[PDB]
């Protein structure tokens, strides 16, 4: 794929000295960067990865599919309550296939409505057609024949066919109901478009196109005989069986009877209308020759064969062949060949191409194909997952996850991590490592985002990761919130300095109830003690107790000692003396500055104060 880096300013022209182009992939898929190391080339070109989906519709799609994946539970795996486990397994899986199909339809819709580019809509519909066909052929009957469940099958088939292409588009209905050079509606066109409708199961419309021109007119008048045919034929059409393969057995009976009766009877109509009515009855009766004759595309043939001839997939091999002999595969669209492949047994080798259309769809497709047991891990062996060692599906899912991580949409990160966590293969420790490396890139902003991260660190036991994340968060109010060892020590020192200099946080340490609950370390305790001391000071024996507490704190710990000395001087028995002594025993620029600020020599003043205290003790 060739895309223009910038369809505005292209930084090169002639081969004029092939310039050194440089490119760096960014942490965000949609924000990479290119530049050039050359003279007069100082522009920066932000480039986003070719064919990247940033849309909301896409993330919605992704979430929906992850839901289907998650909801599949144990059934997303395939075990190579006895004979029912099999049937019920297929039941739920087959249903999941329908869910995927739906989610993709919705997505495709929202793409057609909110869009700049409709190419995405077309590709997504194609993906849907191919998936409808896949379900119709492997996700309904579970290897059995149509009799096993005539209702569901014909429903899906009829659905698949009438969503693949648009024709017959009502823009073509009026196209012939307008064209003349003939009497009323009786040229190869009307009938071709009537048969087409029948072959596609579009019986309602079929009937309508008849009650449009000569149901009662030309027939009820000209030939009363063929009028009865053309009428109770429309009656049989009105009651084509779609639930009982018995009712169909009898239906084709009445139809073949009608075709024989009319077959040899009163010809009171034009030479052409005669046959034109016979063919219609043959097609309805299931004549192979005719079903092929009035078919525009192979899938019309195939569908017809299943609807009017013999409703057995045991003949699909033959049906497809005849169909392709009549109309070759139309290489205009990308869905026809894949459908042919599906029908003809070779399901595989579609994952790479679907991966080219859309990574996501391909991923989950491979996943459900593994669930069905249509593809499995043949490998049989290096301590990790993202390889060929596990499934092809595991591989595609894990790949999608990783791709989601660079998308920068925090909504999908749960999908990514979940995808990895639920991966049916790989050691819990291997996943542990992968998550340990991905999580740090989570684009958290809210509090909740962070709590989610943490919850995942808990759930997976990544204390070194959580410790790192938090470290990133820590990097006055912020510091208060934070309150590694060195940092705590520094915080302690700061608190002590503040106390020496001397609200809600301080009280909590010593809405409010919630905070107390959250709080429920050494630095913190020290600050609390300092606060208590200050409170006592604000409030003789109390003062002494506070002074004692201060001396004890100083012993546990230069600036602090100076502040203490200052406090003692301001205040200016045996225990007190002992404390003073210990302080003297314990006894740079910042300290001197603090001393100068307090005065607005220190050792001498301290000694003098000590002497005074001793004298006081002696007098007592």
């Amino acid at each position: 794929i060739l895309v223009p880096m910038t369809v505005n300013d292209q930084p090169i022209e002639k081969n004029g000295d092939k310039m050194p182009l440089k490119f760096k992939l960014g942490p965000l898929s949609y924000q990479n960067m290119a530049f050039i190391t050359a003279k007069d080339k100082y522009k920066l070109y932000p480039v986003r990865i070719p064919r990247l989906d940033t849309s909301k519709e896409f993330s919605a799609y992704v979430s929906g599919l992850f839901e289907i994946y998650r909801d599949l539970g144990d059934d997303r795996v395939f075990n190579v309550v006895n004979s029912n486990f099999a049937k019920e397994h297929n039941a739920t899986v087959n249903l999941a296939m329908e869910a995927i199909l739906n989610e993709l339809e919705v997505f495709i819709g929202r793409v057609k409505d909110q869009d700049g580019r409709v190419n995405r809509f077309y590709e997504l519909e194609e993906s849907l057609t191919v998936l409808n066909c896949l379900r119709t052929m492997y996700f309904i009957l579970d290897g059995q024949d149509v009799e096993e469940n005539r209702s569901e099958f014909i429903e899906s088939l009829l659905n698949w066919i009438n969503r693949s292409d648009g024709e017959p588009d009502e823009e073509y209905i009026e196209q012939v109901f307008s064209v003349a050079g003939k009497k009323v509606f009786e040229t190869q066109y009307f009938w071709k478009l009537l048969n087409q409708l029948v072959l596609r199961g579009l019986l309602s419309q079929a009937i309508g196109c008849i009650e449009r021109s000569d149901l009662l007119p030309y027939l009820s008048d000209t030939c009363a005989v063929s009028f009865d045919a053309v009428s109770d034929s429309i009656e049989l059409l009105k009651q084509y069986p779609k639930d009982s393969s018995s009712t169909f057995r009898e239906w084709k009976n009445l139809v073949l009877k009608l075709s024989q009766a009319f077959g040899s009877s009163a010809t009171d109509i034009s030479g052409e209308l005669r046959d034109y009515i016979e063919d219609f009855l043959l097609v309805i009766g299931g004549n192979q020759r005719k079903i092929l004759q009035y078919s525009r595309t192979w899938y019309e043939s195939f569908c017809g064969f299943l609807l009017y001839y013999i409703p057995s997939l045991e003949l699909s091999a033959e049906y497809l062949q005849m169909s392709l002999e009549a109309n070759v595969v139309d290489i205009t669209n990308d869905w026809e060949q894949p459908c042919v492949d599906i029908i003809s047994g070779k399901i595989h080798s579609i994952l790479p191409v679907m991966e080219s259309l859309d990574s996501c769809t391909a991923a989950f497709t491979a996943m459900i194909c593994e669930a069905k047991g249509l593809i499995e891990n043949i490998f049989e062996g290096l301590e990790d997952l993202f390889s060929y060692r596990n499934g092809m599906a595991s591989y595609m899912l894990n790949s999608f996850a990783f791709e989601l991580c660079s998308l920068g949409d925090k909504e999908l990160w749960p999908v990514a991590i979940g995808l990895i966590a639920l991966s049916a293969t790989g050691t819990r420790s291997a996943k542990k490592m992968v998550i340990a490396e991905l999580l740090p890139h989570y684009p958290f902003v809210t509090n909740d985002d962070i709590e989610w991260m943490l919850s995942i660190c808990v759930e997976w036991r990544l204390p070194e990761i959580a410790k790192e994340i938090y470290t990133t968060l820590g990097n006055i109010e912020s510091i208060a919130n934070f309150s590694l060892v060195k940092s705590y020590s520094w915080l302690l020192f700061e608190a002590s300095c503040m106390e020496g200099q001397k609200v809600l946080n301080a009280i909590v340490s010593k809405d409010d109830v919630i905070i107390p609950q959250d709080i429920l370390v050494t630095n913190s305790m020290r600050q609390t003690l300092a606060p208590y001391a200050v409170l006592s000071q604000f409030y003789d024996r109390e003062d002494w107790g506070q002074a004692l507490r201060l001396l004890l704190l100083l012993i546990e710990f230069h600036y602090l000692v100076l502040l203490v000395a200052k406090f003692l001087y301001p205040i200016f028995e045996d225990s007190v003396a002992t404390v003073i002594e210990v302080i003297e025993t314990k006894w740079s620029n910042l300290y001197e500055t603090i001393i100068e600020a307090d005065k607005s020599a220190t050792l001498l003043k301290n000694l003098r104060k000590k002497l005074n205290f001793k004298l006081c003790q002696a007098f007592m």
Partner: protein, 307 residues
């Protein structure tokens, strides 16, 4: 996402993303370092700050892990390496938003590259220049972002001839968190890998053979999920190379060549990786950028060509 002017007078050498991909650092020959911010509201890139940082041409740059703060490192032809830390208490574009935290003058030759090490090893970094001597530096006390000690010195090249303008050197650490400390180094035609030994010293654990010219770029890929390592190189001989390195003349390291690509027909100047090591990028003379994904067979295929 339209182009924009860097604000540099002389040619720009390196552009690097921060951890979150929302910030970018640029360094040019006009001896300036510019930092751009990606405004949330208006999805435009807008200059956060510019400033003169070296006496000579600044060739390399790099951001440190966010868990150590906002730190950038620069290497210049003035034989030095400087470290800077963003001071959020300054106006943007004031030229005073990033304070020098230190300078490393040990190099006696110009410097071509500087790369921070994986966060799980502390503030660490490496540099290489004309002197052909790789040097590792460590900020031993994460509190003192000035306390930069020299952790190691290794002679990559042995006899660099005094008459060659034709010089190139590149660095790239192994990002892997669950793999023994190691880093890749390119020097002219050669490309060798170093690994931490039990003795806490760097040893040559292997070489990436095949280069028939100057190696313009190299980068170790994030091995998230894999058990092996992958490093790519953009040579002057016009070939991209991707090597698979597994650890099972004195090595514990195996070396496979996974791919070779000449699609560029000319020198490959830049080689870069995904955040997941899922996509590999290459740029060269043809004025084109190519994105590569790995096949199921572990071969590499071009998933797109930008121009």
């Amino acid at each position: 996402m339209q182009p924009f002017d860097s604000g540099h007078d002389d040619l720009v050498h390196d552009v690097v993303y921060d951890f979150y991909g929302r910030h970018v650092a640029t360094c040019s020959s006009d001896q300036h370092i510019k930092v751009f911010k990606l405004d949330k509201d208006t999805s435009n890139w807008e200059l956060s700050d510019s400033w003169r940082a070296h006496d000579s041409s600044i060739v390399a740059i790099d951001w440190a892990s966010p868990e150590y703060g906002r730190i950038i490192a620069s290497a210049s032809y003035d034989k030095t390496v400087k470290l800077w830390e963003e001071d959020p208490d300054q106006e943007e574009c004031s030229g005073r938003r990033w304070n020098k935290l230190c300078t490393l003058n040990d190099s006696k030759g110009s410097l071509y590259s500087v790369k921070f090490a994986p966060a799980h090893l502390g503030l660490k970094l490496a540099c290489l220049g004309n002197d052909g001597i790789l040097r590792l530096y460590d900020a031993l006390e994460p509190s003192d972002l000035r306390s930069w000690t020299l952790t190691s010195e290794m002679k990559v090249l042995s006899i660099p001839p005094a008459n060659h303008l034709q010089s190139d050197f590149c660095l790239s650490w192994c990002p892997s968190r669950f793999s023994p400390e190691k880093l890749a180094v390119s020097a002219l035609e050669q490309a060798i890998i170093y690994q931490r030994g039990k003795d806490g010293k760097l040893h040559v654990a292997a070489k990436l053979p095949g280069h028939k010219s100057l190696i313009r770029s190299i980068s170790w890929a994030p091995s998230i999920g894999r058990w092996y390592q992958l490093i790519a190189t953009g040579c002057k001989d016009g070939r991209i190379r991707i090597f698979k390195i597994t650890e099972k003349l004195q090595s514990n390291l195996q070396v496979e060549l996974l791919s070779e690509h000449d699609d560029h027909n000319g020198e490959v100047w830049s080689v870069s990786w995904n955040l997941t090591g899922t996509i590999l990028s290459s740029a060269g003379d043809d004025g084109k950028v190519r994105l590569w994904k790995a096949t199921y067979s572990n071969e590499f295929k071009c998933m797109s060509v930008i121009t």
